[PDB]
Design a protein around this ligand. Structure first.
Ligand SMILES: N[C@@H](Cc1c[nH]c2ccccc12)C(=O)O
Ligand SMILES: N[C@@H](Cc1c[nH]c2ccccc12)C(=O)O
Ligand SMILES: N[C@@H](Cc1c[nH]c2ccccc12)C(=O)O
Ligand SMILES: N[C@@H](Cc1c[nH]c2ccccc12)C(=O)O
Ligand SMILES: N[C@@H](Cc1c[nH]c2ccccc12)C(=O)O
Ligand SMILES: N[C@@H](Cc1c[nH]c2ccccc12)C(=O)O
Ligand SMILES: N[C@@H](Cc1c[nH]c2ccccc12)C(=O)O
Ligand SMILES: N[C@@H](Cc1c[nH]c2ccccc12)C(=O)O
Ligand SMILES: N[C@@H](Cc1c[nH]c2ccccc12)C(=O)O
Ligand SMILES: N[C@@H](Cc1c[nH]c2ccccc12)C(=O)O
Ligand SMILES: N[C@@H](Cc1c[nH]c2ccccc12)C(=O)O
Lengths: 69, 68, 69, 68, 67, 68, 68, 68, 69, 68, 69
C-alpha cells in the first residue's frame, strides 16, 4: 500500500535509481529507460528514496515535476 | 493496494512486472494488442511496472502516455 | 475491501480475464460477456491483474477507459 | 466492503454472484422483476457480480446501465 | 459498516435481507407502510438487501427509486 | 459508528431499534413528542432503525422525511 | 467517536443520554440554561442522545433545532 | 481524537469536563478570563464538555457561541 | 495526533500544557516572545493547551486569536 | 505522521525540538542559514517544535511566518 | 509514510537526512546536480530532511524553494 512515482523518459538512457532503506544509504539498482517508456515504481521495504537522472516527466501525489539531463 | 490501467494503442505493447525484494529484474511480461486493456495491481511480487510501446495509462496521479 | 472494475460489454464475446496473484502469472479464468451485460469484478487473493479483450466500457477509480476489439 | 445498487428496468433481470477463490463459478442468481432494487455487497463468498437484463446500476465509480 | 435508507411511498413495501455466507436466502422481510422510513445496515447476517414496492432509496451512491 | 438524527414534527413519533443478529425484532421504541430530537447510533444491539410518524431525518446520505 | 454540540436557546434544556446495551433507559439528564453549550460524545455508556427544550444543535450531518 | 477551541469573550468563563463512564459529574472547571484560549481534547477522563459564560467556540462542526 | 500552531504577537506569551488523566493541572508553561512560533501536539502527557497573551493560532478548525490581559 | 517545513529567511534561524514525555526541555537545535529548508516530523522524541528567527513555515494548517 | 520531492536548480545541492531517535545527527548527504530529482521518504532512520543549495521542493503542504549559498 505504499506511494508510487510515475517516470516517463523524454530521451534515451534515463536512470531511475533506487536507494537502500535502512541505516545505510547506497544505490541498489538503476533501471535504465529509453525515450517514451514509462516506469511506475513504488517505495518498498528495500527502496526508501528514488533518484532520477536524465530528461523525464514525473508524477507523484504532490504533482508533476520534470528532471533535466 | 494501487493499480495502473494500461490501454494498448498499437500491437505488442509490453507491460513488464519488476520483482519486489532486494533484487530487481523482470518476472513477467504481459503483451497487449491494440485496444486491449490491462488493469494491474502492485503486489507481494511486483513493486514496479514498466510499459513499452504506445499506450494510454491511468494511475491515481492522472493520465500519462507511453511512446513505443 | 479491495478495489473493483466495472466492465460493460459493447459487443458479443467480450472476455474479462483474471491473472493469478503470486510468483506464477497465468490466466486462471476468462469470463465471457455478451452485448450489454455488466461484470463488476474485484481484485482478490487469486486475481492481481485483469485483462479485457473486445469492445467494452470500463470504469475504475481512475475514471472511464474503453477497450476496442 | 463495497456494494452495488441494481435496479431492474424489465422483468427477469439476473444478478449473479461469482465464487471467491481459485475457482470461479456462479453460486447464486437473484432474479429481479421490473422496478425491484437489490443492494448487494462483495463478501467472503462473492468476489465478482454479473448483471444480465436491462438494469440501472450504481457503484462507487458512478452509473452504468446493462441492457438485455 | 454501510447502510441504506428506505422510505415507503405506498403501503406494503418489503425490505428483505439476504443471508451472508455460502448460501443465499431471505431471512427477514420488514413491511413498511406509506411514509415509514427504515435505515438498515449491512451486517454479519445480511450481505444483500432487496426492496419490493414503491420507495425512495438513499445510499452512499445517491438516490434510486424502486416501483 | 454511524448515527441518524430524528426531529419529531408531530407528537408520538416512534423511533424503533431492530435487533442485530440472526433474529430480527423490535427491542425498543423511543417515543418523541413534537420538537424533540433524538440522535441515535448503530450499535452492537441495533443494526436497523425504523421511524414511524411525521419526522425530519438526517443521515450521512442527506435529509429524508417520514410521514404519519 | 462522533460528538454533538447543543446550545440551549432557553432555560432548562435537557440533554439526555440513553444507555448503550441490550437495555435502553435514561442514565443521565444534563440541564442547560439559556446560552450554555454542551459538547457531548457517544461513548461506552451512551449510544443515543435526546434533546428536550429549545436548542440549536450541530452534528456531522449539519444543523437541526429542537423546540420546546 | 477530537478537540474543541474555546476563546473567552468576557472574564470568568468556565470550561467544565464531565467524567467519561457510568457516572456523569463535573471533575474539572477551567476558568478563562477575557481573551484567553483553551484548546481541549476529548479524553479517557472527559467525554462531554460544557461551556458557561460568553465564549467563541470552534469544533469540527463549525463555529458556535455560548452566552452568559 | 493533532497539533496547534501558536505565533506570539507580543513578548511573554505562555502556551500552557494541562495534564492528561483524572488530574488536571499545568505541567509546563512554554514562554514565547514576539514573533516566535510554537507548533505543539496533543500527547500522552498533554490533553488540553491554554494560551495566555496576544497570539495568532491555527488549528484544524481554522484561525483564532488569543488576547492578553 | 505530521511534519513542518521551515525555510530560513535570514542566517541563524533556530529550529528547536522539545522532548516528548512528562518533561519538557529542548533536546536538539538545528540552525539554518538563509535560504535553507528543513522538513521535520513530529516523532517519538519530539512532540513540540519552536522556531526562532525569520522563517517561512508550512504545516497542514497553512502558512505561518516567524519573525526574529 | 510521507515523502518530499527535490529538484536541483544548480550543481551540488545537498539533500541531508537527520537521524530519528534521541540522538540527532546527519547520517547521509545526497548530492544532486542541476536538473536531477530525488524523491525521498521519512523512514525508520530519517525523521527530518535538510536541503542546502538552490532547489525546487514539493511536499504535501505544497511548493517551497531553497535558495543557495
Ligand atoms: N526490487 C525493487 C524494485 C523497485 C521498486 N521501486 C524502485 C525504484 C527504483 C529502483 C528499483 C525499484 C524493490 O522492491 O525495492
Ligand atoms: N502474478 C503477478 C501478476 C501481476 C500483477 N501486476 C503485474 C504487473 C506486471 C506483470 C505482472 C503482474 C503478481 O501477483 O505480481
Ligand atoms: N474466483 C475469482 C473470481 C474473480 C474476481 N475478480 C475476477 C476478475 C477476473 C476473473 C475472475 C475474477 C477470484 O476470487 O479471484
Ligand atoms: N450469501 C451471499 C449473498 C450475496 C452478497 N452479494 C451478492 C451478490 C450477488 C449474489 C449473491 C450475493 C454472500 O454473502 O456472498
Ligand atoms: N440500548 C440501545 C440504544 C439505541 C441506540 N440506537 C437506537 C435506535 C433505536 C432504539 C434504541 C437505540 C443500543 O445501544 O442499541
Ligand atoms: N437482525 C438483522 C437486522 C437487519 C439489519 N439490516 C437488515 C436488512 C434487511 C432485513 C433485516 C436487517 C441483522 O442484523 O442483519
Ligand atoms: N486531565 C483532563 C484535561 C482536559 C481535557 N479536556 C478537558 C475539557 C474540560 C476540562 C478538562 C479537560 C483530561 O484529560 O480529561
Ligand atoms: N458519563 C457519560 C457522559 C456523557 C457523554 N455524552 C453524554 C450525552 C448525554 C448524557 C451524558 C453523556 C458518558 O461517558 O457516556
Ligand atoms: N513534553 C511535552 C511537550 C509538549 C507537547 N505539547 C505541549 C503543549 C503545551 C506544553 C508542552 C507540550 C509533552 O510531550 O506533552
Ligand atoms: N537509507 C535512508 C535513505 C533515505 C530516505 N530518505 C532520506 C532523506 C535524506 C537522506 C537519506 C534518505 C533511509 O532509509 O532513511
Ligand atoms: N532525532 C530527532 C530529529 C528531529 C525530528 N524532528 C525534529 C524537530 C526538531 C529537532 C529535531 C528533530 C527525532 O527523531 O526526534
Amino acid at each position: 500500500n505504499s506511494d508510487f512515482v510515475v517516470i516517463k523518459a523524454l530521451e534515451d538512457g534515463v536512470n531511475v535509481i533506487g536507494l537502500t532503506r535502512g541505516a545505510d544509504t547506497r544505490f541498489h539498482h538503476s533501471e535504465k529507460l529509453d525515450k517514451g517508456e514509462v516506469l511506475i515504481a513504488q517505495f518498498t521495504e528495500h527502496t526508501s528514496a528514488i533518484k532520477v537522472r536524465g530528461k523525464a516527466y514525473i508524477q507523484t501525489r504532490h504533482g508533476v515535476i520534470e528532471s533535466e539531463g
